[PDB]
Scaffold this active site. Structure first.
Site, short mmCIF file in Angstrom:
data_model
loop_
_atom_site.label_atom_id
_atom_site.label_comp_id
_atom_site.label_asym_id
_atom_site.label_seq_id
_atom_site.Cartn_x
_atom_site.Cartn_y
_atom_site.Cartn_z
N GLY A 107 146.42 37.41 43.42
CA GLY A 107 145.73 37.94 44.58
C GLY A 107 146.68 38.61 45.55
O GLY A 107 146.53 38.48 46.77
N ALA A 108 147.68 39.33 45.00
CA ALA A 108 148.69 40.08 45.77
C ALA A 108 149.33 39.23 46.87
O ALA A 108 149.81 39.75 47.88
CB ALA A 108 148.08 41.36 46.36
N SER A 190 149.27 38.15 37.80
CA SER A 190 149.49 39.05 38.92
C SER A 190 150.47 38.36 39.85
O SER A 190 151.55 37.95 39.44
CB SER A 190 148.20 39.45 39.67
N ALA A 191 150.08 38.20 41.11
CA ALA A 191 150.91 37.46 42.06
C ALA A 191 151.25 36.04 41.56
O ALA A 191 152.31 35.49 41.89
CB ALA A 191 150.21 37.37 43.41
N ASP A 316 146.82 47.78 32.94
CA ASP A 316 146.94 47.00 34.17
C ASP A 316 146.91 47.89 35.40
O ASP A 316 146.40 47.49 36.45
CB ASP A 316 148.24 46.18 34.14
N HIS A 423 143.16 45.42 34.81
CA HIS A 423 143.92 44.36 35.46
C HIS A 423 143.09 43.09 35.58
O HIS A 423 141.93 43.11 35.99
CB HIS A 423 144.37 44.83 36.85
#
Ligand SMILES: [Zn+2]
Ligand SMILES: [Zn+2]
Ligand SMILES: [Zn+2]
Ligand SMILES: [Zn+2]
Ligand SMILES: [Zn+2]
Length: 521
Positions: A107-108, A190-191, A316, A423
């Site tokens: 979630g960045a 991701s994050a 992605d 992604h």
């Protein structure tokens, strides 16, 4: 073949048993065990006291304070450091020495929850089909997790320390649930994948972590390390009225500001952007000289004995290409050479005109033949995928391999579509959703999900995706500098699914040709 009350370091905990099938298998489910005290804004986490009687662990707890989708309000709470546990159970006796997999969501570094999007991160299907314990948990995100001054006044990385506190908790408590504490696997996306990577590189985790899986993110991705934190700290101070003149007075002010105001101080606009989305990653990990002692590229000795999978999705970068270049979606508008040059030039600024040109030329080599709009659009997706995910992941792979002692290394590419792979396409298969909500999915989707869980949990058990309680469709060959092999995951898998040297000229372009050019000013 049931745990009952489990004695943890804080006291007894009571979950829920759920029968599965007819024969008498089941799973034990615990939600809402605290692993750290209620958080104080911008301070390191601390132990959670201890209760008497029996903590009931029946419902998910609140996630940490974060902005809503329309960044007009917040949800969650400062009391958010909770974890959740699924423990599979056979028919004879209670499980013992299970591999333990800890999930770190992405979630960045701006959003997320232990249960996640919706629940997506229900660990039941991984735990029952792979025969492992799955742990999910919350950590702090956004400014409350990562605001930093770049020095000791406000060292940042609070969200990474929360992750470490959860891992440490699991190590010292999971045996009571039937887990093997020396066999802990981190996985995340991701994050979360970047965080898994950062945890393996941190001296804080010596002795705690046995293996790791990075999905679509490594500590070397350019959106992971904030190189100018003081700038972003000062934007937040101005927005909430803190004096900017002095670092120590700025820190003290920020720590006293309303945590809702800190969270909503800065907003990432969706509509009109000056720069690529990468320029707007603000509150992310920092090189603090403590939890991250140096540039992550110099830390891989700490992962010498941590088995490591890292991989990416086929496409992605699609979501980021669509935002930075909205003509990727609407087929009414052409993608032009002028727009791609502008995009590429904004990614290559420190190498100037010549670095933009070299990059534009390599990525548009193929545009002379059939300069069609699909090849052009594909090229913008591949460019973002390369720079944000693929090239950092291959550098991490090579660096992990170079420093390995007992550690094995493995690479994959996820390419299965359902509408290649966009992604976070992989998450729902990794978590078994095609089995947990079967009507929403096709039979071929249950085929990819089975194979990913089999690989993932075989790897959790042994450090070898081919060897465990599950059969696998194709032999996954460990990564070496020589073979540079990756497994390509698709609906149909056989011996040809092991490939090698993914997009190798581009990796060579970025790691040899591009960095050989002079930085300008
Ligand atoms: Zn509490
Ligand atoms: Zn929630
Ligand atoms: Zn509260
Ligand atoms: Zn032109
Ligand atoms: Zn082999």
């Amino acid at each position: 073949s049931k745990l009952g009350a489990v004695y943890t370091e804080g006291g007894f905990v009571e979950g829920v048993n759920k029968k599965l099938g007819l024969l008498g298998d089941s799973v034990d489910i615990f939600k809402g065990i605290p692993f750290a005290a209620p958080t104080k804004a911008l301070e390191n986490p601390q132990p959670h006291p201890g209760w008497q009687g029996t903590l009931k662990a029946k419902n998910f707890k609140k996630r940490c304070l974060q902005a809503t989708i329309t960044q007009d309000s917040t949800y969650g709470d400062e009391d958010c450091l909770y974890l959740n546990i699924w423990v599979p159970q056979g028919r004879k006796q209670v499980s013992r020495d299970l591999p333990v997999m800890i999930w770190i969501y992405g979630g960045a570094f701006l959003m997320g929850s232990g249960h996640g999007a919706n629940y997506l991160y229900d660990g039941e299907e991984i735990a029952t089909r792979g025969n492992v314990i799955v742990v999910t948990f919350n950590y702090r995100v956004g400014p409350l997790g990562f605001l930093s001054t770049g020095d000791a006044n406000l060292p940042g990385n609070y969200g990474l320390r929360d992750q470490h506190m959860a891992i440490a908790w699991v190590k010292r408590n999971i045996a009571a649930f039937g887990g093997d504490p020396d066999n802990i696997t981190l996985f995340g996306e991701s994050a979360g994948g970047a965080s898994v990577s950062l945890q393996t590189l941190s001296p804080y985790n010596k002795g705690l972590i046995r293996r790791a899986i990075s999905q679509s993110g490594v500590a070397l991705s350019p959106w992971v390390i904030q190189k100018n934190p003081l700038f972003w700290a000062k934007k937040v101070a101005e927005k909430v009225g803190c004096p900017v003149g002095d670092a120590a007075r700025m820190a003290q002010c920020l720590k006293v500001t309303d945590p809702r105001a800190l969270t909503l101080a800065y907003k990432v606009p969706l509509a009109g952007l000056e720069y690529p989305m990468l320029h707007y990653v603000g509150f992310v990990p920092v090189i603090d000289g403590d939890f991250i002692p140096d540039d992550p590229i110099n830390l891989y000795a700490n992962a010498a004995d941590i088995d490591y999978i890292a991989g990416t999705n086929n496409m992605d970068g699609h979501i980021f290409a669509s935002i930075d270049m909205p003509a990727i979606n609407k087929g009414n508008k052409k993608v032009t050479e002028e727009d791609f040059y502008k995009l590429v030039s904004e990614f290559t600024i420190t190498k100037g005109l010549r670095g933009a040109k070299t990059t534009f030329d390599v990525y548009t080599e193929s545009w002379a033949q059939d300069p069609s709009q699909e090849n052009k659009k594909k090229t913008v997706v591949d460019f973002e995928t390369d720079v944000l995910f693929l090239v950092p992941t291959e550098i991490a792979l090579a660096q992990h391999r170079a420093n390995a002692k007992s550690a094995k290394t493995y690479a994959y590419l996820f390419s299965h579509p359902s509408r290649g792979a966009d992604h976070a396409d992989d998450i729902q298969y990794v978590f078994g959703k095609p089995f947990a909500t079967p009507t929403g999915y096709r039979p071929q989707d249950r085929t990819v999900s089975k194979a990913m869980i089999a690989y993932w949990t075989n790897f959790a058990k042994t450090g070898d995706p081919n060897m465990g309680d599950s059969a696998v469709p194709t032999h996954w060959e460990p990564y070496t500098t020589e073979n540079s092999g990756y497994l390509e995951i698709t609906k149909k898998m056989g011996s040809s699914s092991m490939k090698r040297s993914l997009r190798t000229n581009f990796l060579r372009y970025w790691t040899l040709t591009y960095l050989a050019l002079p930085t300008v000013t």
